[PDB]
Amino acid sequence: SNASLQNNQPVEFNHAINYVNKIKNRFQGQPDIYKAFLEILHTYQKEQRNAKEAGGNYTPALTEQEVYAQVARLFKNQEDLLSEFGQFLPDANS
Amino acid sequence: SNADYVQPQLRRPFELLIAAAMERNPTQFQLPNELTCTTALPGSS
């Protein structure tokens, strides 16, 4: 008896690993850009924590749309990174 | 409850992304990792 999920999220996690590596490689030399994005994640994790602290009834101030728009405004010139990012919230998925 | 049917939420897109960021970085999310008080200032390699 398992029921504990033996098949976790492998492909999207491995894609994420490569993506974060790709983010570094993409803007290697400019810490502010990568750090700013990291702080975005930091901020969303904070908001998510605070939301679930109230059970989830309380909605955070940082929405997925907000995040994505912030990321797009964050990484300019190279949309290829954002193109990779699109897999972490694909419009094709509802 | 309004929905007593409890269901795990493995489908969390941001979770594996931020987790990957947490793994491929020295996880500086101001999150107490382990023995981390003054160990990492600029981070690890």
Side-chain angles (χ1 to χ4, degrees):
Chain A
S1 188
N2 292 88
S4 47
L5 296 174
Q6 298 302 147
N7 188 33
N8 191 28
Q9 304 286 210
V11 295
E12 49 282 275
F13 183 71
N14 187 28
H15 284 170
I17 299 298
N18 283 273
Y19 179 59
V20 178
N21 176 86
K22 184 172 303 183
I23 300 180
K24 285 195 181 70
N25 181 270
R26 188 76 295 175
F27 293 101
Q28 180 181 29
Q30 285 96 151
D32 304 82
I33 302 179
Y34 182 45
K35 174 180 176 55
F37 175 71
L38 190 62
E39 298 302 333
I40 298 177
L41 304 178
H42 173 215
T43 304
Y44 186 65
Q45 184 58 268
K46 180 190 64 182
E47 291 297 289
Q48 179 176 329
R49 184 201 67 120
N50 289 26
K52 283 300 299 180
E53 179 174 80
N57 190 89
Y58 162 78
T59 49
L62 192 61
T63 326
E64 292 69 72
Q65 184 188 151
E66 191 73 82
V67 179
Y68 185 71
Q70 294 177 151
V71 182
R73 176 167 294 178
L74 199 289
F75 299 109
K76 311 298 291 184
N77 298 30
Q78 291 299 93
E79 188 190 76
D80 69 318
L81 198 63
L82 257 297
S83 305
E84 297 290 284
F85 197 82
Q87 302 177 91
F88 301 103
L89 35 89
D91 183 272
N93 294 151
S94 311
Chain B
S1 191
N2 62 328
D4 290 88
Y5 168 58
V6 57
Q7 174 174 328
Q9 303 294 148
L10 183 60
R11 182 173 168 138
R12 303 179 188 139
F14 274 97
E15 185 160 91
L16 54 292
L17 197 283
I18 301 175
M22 197 164 302
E23 295 295 288
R24 280 285 63 223
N25 292 319
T27 166
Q28 53 158 89
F29 299 83
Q30 280 70 32
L31 183 65
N33 296 320
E34 181 58 287
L35 302 177
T36 322
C37 304
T38 43
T39 11
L41 185 62
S44 43
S45 306

